[PDB]
Amino acid sequence: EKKWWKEAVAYQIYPRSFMDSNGDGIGDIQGVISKLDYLSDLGIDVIWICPIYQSPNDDNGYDISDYKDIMKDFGTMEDFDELLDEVHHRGMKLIMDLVINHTSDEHPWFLESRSAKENPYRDYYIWHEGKDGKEPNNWESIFSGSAWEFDEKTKEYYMHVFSKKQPDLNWENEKVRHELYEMVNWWLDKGIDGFRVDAISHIKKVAGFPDLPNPEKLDYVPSFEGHMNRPGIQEHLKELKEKTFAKYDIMTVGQAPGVTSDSADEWVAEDGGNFNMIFQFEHMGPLDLIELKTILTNWQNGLEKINGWNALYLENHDQIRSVNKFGSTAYRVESAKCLAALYFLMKGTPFIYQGQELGMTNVKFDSIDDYDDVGMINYYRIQREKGDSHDEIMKVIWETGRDNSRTPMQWNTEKNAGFSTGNPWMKVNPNYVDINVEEQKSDKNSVLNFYKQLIKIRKQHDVLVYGTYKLLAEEDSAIYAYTRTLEGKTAVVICNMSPNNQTFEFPFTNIEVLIHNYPLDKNETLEQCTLHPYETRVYLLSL
Ligand SMILES: OC[C@H]1O[C@H](O[C@H]2[C@H](O)[C@@H](O)[C@@H](O[C@H]3[C@H](O)[C@@H](O)[C@@H](O)O[C@@H]3CO)O[C@@H]2CO)[C@H](O)[C@@H](O)[C@@H]1O
Ligand SMILES: [Ca+2]
Ligand SMILES: [Ca+2]
């Protein structure tokens, strides 16, 4: 059945890096308000804003110390209320980031929990006595080091999947769950339009927290088999839905690593799924194009079978830039557009991450002091102590680190690319002199205007929202081609995902080119497409 959230195009803002309105180098809510014309003109329907709640910022808002107050760096609740009012008067919607696997260690519940074994908040978090004079088990944090941190006062360890300042909440405690549901409903009562639900596949821990294998005798071992998508999680997520989301006309997208296309039914089926869609991570870990076709096609066909719906994306605040990960910096403009048509025109709701629509790319800062990510700074400290060299650590940070997606948004060629009049919290990528909103708005051939046109064709042609996906030319190691079919219309999406010229055989009573990123050759025959590197074309056929 048709739904507003299926038809939408979403845009993800990382507010610390979107727009600084007051010169302190930190993006803020009045900065977002000042750029709403940009998003409305792009054609965005839904804005997902990353966390904006009170936080010490050990993990840039994902360590929350008050769920009901706004981060001071970003503004006040009055600024939030102005943002939501202006978004809604522009006919757009706003979803917030719901972070309920863990809190800050400065949240009042944790300050109480850590104070005594008998404090009434003790069991709001995950506490355990050590084993053999060390931690309760051998589990590694996702941000490196142990997943357990010792409290000298009470002589027990608390669990943190993420940073030492992000103690995990104990979802086995009914009192925790009840306080969380009241908080979620307090936000929904304000008239927000839903949530992106952070780290939500991590809320169930294997009981007893058993050690995992360690044949290499590492200090700690990766611990996803102890806490990622574990049996028992669905009971908690079904109750979360019944007590909160199901009471409101909203959209939910869960961040759900560890879910595969054949295990997705309980997450996203129309009949009984806990969210409307999830971010799945199987495609985010020459490029093996056939492997990518396999993953994305498994999710297109798999969710069509269960009446689920895909969240389509190639970028977010936790990944490197998609030109580097999936395209080519030697063909930056052409590959940015080719990737855009490829991912955006599958069946699902597309998400655009800030700067993806400009073709922004990874940065390379010379010094570890120029980086911020708690995960990579802890990785550096831990690996340096083990004897890894500075150079080998920097290669990991430069090639894989999510700070590549957190540099200031590139609005123009003024100081700091127009993101701030002060000293940005993270330096601007030097390539803003070439890559910026102002230059792209005036260039018909820009990446930005290619995204504007994708959004327009998807809105104008129902086949691009609701049409059935089918993979074409599966064994072609260069060409990713697929169709969308609805009634008497078929759209053909052709993407030459290679840095070479290629030829491709086109797979009706009328044919139209809907978008293309190279000039068309009038002598070219439809039958024998001669594609340039990273050339994409979308055709609409009337059957
Ligand atoms: O609030 C903490 C943290 O949560 C969100 O992202 C984290 C994911 O929840 C978490 O699973 C982990 O992702 C890893 C995948 O599990 C793994 O399969 C593969 O993709 O590598 C990832 C290593 O991180 O980590 C991410 C954080 O990187 C949230 O969106 C983050 O901003 C936040 O820091
Ligand atoms: Ca600011
Ligand atoms: Ca040609």
Author numbering: 2 to 286, 295 to 516, 521 to 556
Source paper text:
Bacillus sp. AHU2216 α-glucosidase (BspAG13_31A), belonging to the glycoside hydrolase family 13 subfamily 31, specifically cleaves α-(1→4)-glucosidic linkages and shows high disaccharide specificity. BspAG13_31A has three domains common to GH13 enzymes: domain A, a catalytic domain that adopts a (β/α)8-barrel fold; domain B, a long loop connecting the third β-strand and third α-helix of domain A (β→α loop 3); domain C, a domain formed by two antiparallel β-sheets that follows domain A. The maltose moiety of G3 and maltotetraose (G4), covering subsites +1 and +2 of this enzyme, adopts a less stable conformation than the global minimum energy conformation, presumably because of steric hindrance by Asn258 at subsite +2.
Crystals of E256Q/N258G and E256Q/N258P were prepared by co-crystallization in the presence of 5 mM G3 and G4, respectively, and the structures of E256Q/N258G and E256Q/N258P were solved at 1.7 Å and 1.5 Å resolutions, respectively. Structural analysis of E256Q/N258G and E256Q/N258P in complex with G3 revealed that the conformation of the maltose moiety bound at subsites +1 and +2 of the double-mutant enzymes was different from that of E256Q. Torsion angles of d-glucosyl residues in subsites +1 and +2 of E256Q/N258G and E256Q/N258P were close to the torsion angles of d-glucosyl residues in the stable α-glucan: Φ (5-O, 1-C, 4′-O, 4′C) = 102° and Ψ (1-C, 4′O, 4′-C, 5′-C) = –120°, which is considered the global minimum energy structure. A molecular mechanics study of maltose suggested that torsion angles of d-glucosyl residues at subsite +1 and +2 in the E256Q-G3 complex are less stable than the global minimum, and the conformation of G3 observed in E256Q/N258G and E256Q/N258P is predicted to be more thermodynamically stable than that in E256Q. This conformational difference of G3 presumably arises from the elimination of steric hindrance by Asn258. The orientation of the side chain of Phe282 in E256Q/N258G, E256Q/N258P, and E256Q differed, presumably because of the closely located amino acid residue at position 258 (Gly, Pro, and Asn in E256Q/N258G, E256Q/N258P, and E256Q, respectively). In the E256Q/N258P-G3 complex, interactions between Phe282 and the d-glucosyl residue in subsite +2 are absent, whereas these interactions were observed in E256Q/N258G and E256Q.
